[PDB]
Amino acid sequence: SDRTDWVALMRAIRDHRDEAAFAELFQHFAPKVKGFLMKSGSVASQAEECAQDVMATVWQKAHLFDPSRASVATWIFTIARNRRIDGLRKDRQPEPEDLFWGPDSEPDQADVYEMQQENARLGRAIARLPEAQRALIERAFFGDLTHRELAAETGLPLGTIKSRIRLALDRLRQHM
Amino acid sequence: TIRHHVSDALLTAYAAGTLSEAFSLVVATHLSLCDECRARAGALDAVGGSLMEETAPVALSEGSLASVMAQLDRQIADPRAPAPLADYVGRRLEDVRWRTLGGGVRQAILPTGGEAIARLLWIPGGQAVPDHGHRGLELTLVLQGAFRDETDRFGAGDIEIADQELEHTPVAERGLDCICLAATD
Ligand SMILES: [Zn+2]
Ligand SMILES: [Zn+2]
């Protein structure tokens, strides 16, 4: 691990209430949450406020983070997108039941490693996308209604991440 | 088994957070019941996570980190109604504010933001919901039992997606008593 190994920093938050670990995650992801919510239609002042609240949840709910099912960026995003958008909802977006690993079991490290792999793979993929395709994806996430499907107009390797998640969830259920 | 899933386009809108609360609550309640759609959505999530990581950062004001770290907490129920539905019902699904309506059905309109409506349905034994066209897209999740309608059988956990061009008559199948969560725009 590294100043920049987000999964390990997240476990440092979790296992040791590591605040220097939290400084690393904040300094990287807070300006990125800010920039993101602004592309989502937020004004700078409110996007900063939200970025700050996101990162506060990251510390509070750090237990909920499962790297056999998500990258840090993804989970953080999850928290960012489930905020209240007032015209859409009265509170945070309804999210499903919380399935987390107890204060005991880590997920199988092999799953974690294979989850972060498939994940880096897809990040590598989004990056190399023609810009006119990367704009179809950005629009999905920034300012567009339900008449819009992304796993069906893009050709991104979402297939192994899915099974990775299905297989991860099964292990979770066997354990729990 | 569960054979009737959240559509791709509603997964993509869930992933984005761009869905009215009614449509989110049904979809998220299906995720708590269906590990298939959890994985489907969790991969759509990976896309935004990837988008976020590659977003050009915007600086927060000087002092933002230490301001957040100061307020850190430093080193500090009904198996039919899971997930975010338990929020709207508060233990015991059989106990809400029901409205009988009235050829064998009763309903509770669940409190939500947005402009789409969310309601619990209660279709007993062998009772049929009287035929309803749609003033938009409709979403139906079975929490108990089963019901027959469209082209298919829908059981506990299954999700029906109804269009605007759809006339249908949801008849409850016999045996258990059919309780649903529905969403319209
Ligand atoms: Zn499903
Ligand atoms: Zn209907």
Show me where the domains of chain A are located: 1-176
| Domain endpoint, select from B51, B68, B92 | B92
Structural domains of chain B, count? 2
Q: Pick from B34, B65, B92: which residue ends a domain?
A: B92
Q: Output the domain CATH number for residue B39.
A: 1.10.10.1320
Q: Does B80 touch chain A (CB under 8 A)?
A: no
Q: Do residues B149 and B160 share a domain? A: yes
| Ligand 1 centroid – CA A45 distance (Å) | 38
Give, for B138, the enclosing helix (H) or strand (E): strand B138-144
Nearest to A68 by CA among A167, A176, A173: A167
Residue where a domain stops, chosen among B92, B112, B146: B92
Clarify whether residues B21 and B56 are in a common domain.
yes
β pairing state of B99-100 and B159-162:
unpaired
Terminal Cα distance for chain A, rounded? 29
Task: Please tell me whether residues B65 and B122 are part of one structural domain.
Answer: no
Q: Are residues B146 and B178 in the same domain?
A: yes
Ligand of minimum distance to the alpha carbon of B138: 2
| Partners of residue B80 in chain A, C-beta under 8 Å | none
Write the secondary structure of chain A as one string of H (helix), E (strand) and C (coil): CCCCCHHHHHHHHHHHCCHHHHHHHHHHHHHHHHHHHHHCCCCHHHHHHHHHHHHHHHHHCHHHCCCCCCCHHHHHHHHHHCCCCCCCCCCCCCCCCCCCCCCCCCCCHHHHHHHHHHHHHHHHHHHCCCHHHHHHHHHHHHCCCCCCCCCCCCCCCCHHHHHHHHHHHHHHHHHC
Contact B83, A93 (CB under 8 A): no
From the list A143, A161, A173, the residue facing B43 with the nearest CB is: A161
> Within chain B, how many helices (H) and strands (E) appear?
5, 9
Q: How far apart are CA A154 and CA A130, in angstroms?
A: 12
The token pair at B12 is 């993509």
The length of chain B is 185
Contacts of A73 in chain B (CB under 8 A): 49-50, 52-53
Q: Choose among A140, A16, A14, A126: nearest CA to A75.
A: A14
What interhelical angle do B35-53 and A109-127 show, nearest 10? Answer: 50
Looking at the structure, do residues B99 and B25 belong to the same domain, yes or no? no
Query: What is the enclosing helix (H) or strand (E) of B18?
Result: none
Task: Please name the residues in contact with B162: beta carbons below 8 A apart, sequence gap of 6 or more.
Answer: B134, B137, B138, B139, B140, B150, B168
**SS3 call for B27:** helix
Residues B38 and B123 in one domain: no
What is the spatial distance between Cα B39 and Cα A8, in angstroms, rounded to a whole number?
Answer: 23
Strands B146-148 and B106-110 turn out to be unpaired
To test the contact with chain A by mutation, choose from B25, B29, B55 the residue with the greatest count of A C-beta atoms within 10 A, namely B55
Burial (0-12, 13-18, 19+ Cβ within 10 Å), A109: exposed
Q: Residue A35 carries which side chain, given as an amino acid letter?
A: G
Final resolution, Å: 2.4
User: Are B19 and B82 within one domain?
Assistant: yes
Measure Cα distances from B33 to A162, B10, B28, B155 in Å.
Answer: 17, 16, 9, 12
Chain B: nearest CA to A13, how far in angstroms?
A: 10
B159/chain A closest Cα distance in angstroms = 15
Note whether A6 and A25 are within 8 A (CB).
Answer: yes
Interatomic CA distance for residues B39 and B58, integer angstroms: 31
On whether both B117 and B128 belong to a single domain, the answer is: yes
CATH number of the domain that residue B157 is part of: 2.60.120.10
- Residues with Cβ within 8 Å of A132's Cβ and at least 6 positions away in sequence, in order, are none
- What domain range is B19 assigned to? 1-92
Residue B12 and residue B83 in one domain? yes
User: What gap in Å lies between CA B118 and CA B105, rounded to an integer?
Assistant: 16
Cα B172 from Cα B122, distance rounded (Å): 9
Token pair in block for residue A44: 């700078």
